[PDB]
Amino acid sequence: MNQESVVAAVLIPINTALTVGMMTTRVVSPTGIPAEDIPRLISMQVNQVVPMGTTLMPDMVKGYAPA
């Protein structure tokens, strides 16, 4: 029951295009966006200032959506 969740590998500001070099996978709680959405978050900007280490949420990304 330990699924890797997207984690701001770096200080991700608001309305900031997400990249593969900005996010990361880590077993954080609560478990947010799946590491499988990492490549789905790319090109997508955040709707909030997400600090480095702050789990990425689905309601914390613009134009985002599950798959």
TrEMBL record:
Name the UniProt record assigns to this protein: Ice-structuring protein
Chief location bin: secreted
Record-stated family: Belongs to the type-III AFP family.
Organism in which the protein naturally occurs: Zoarces elongatus
Localization terms from the record: Secreted
GO cellular component: extracellular region
Start and end residues of each AFP-like domain: 5-64
Keyword Secreted listed: yes
Annotated keywords: Antifreeze protein, Secreted, Signal
Entry function: Contributes to protect fish blood from freezing at subzero sea water temperatures. Lowers the blood freezing point. Binds to nascent ice crystals and prevents further growth. Lowers the blood freezing point. Contributes to protect fish blood from freezing at subzero sea water temperatures. Binds to nascent ice crystals and prevents further growth.
Residues of the full protein shown: 23 to 88 of 88
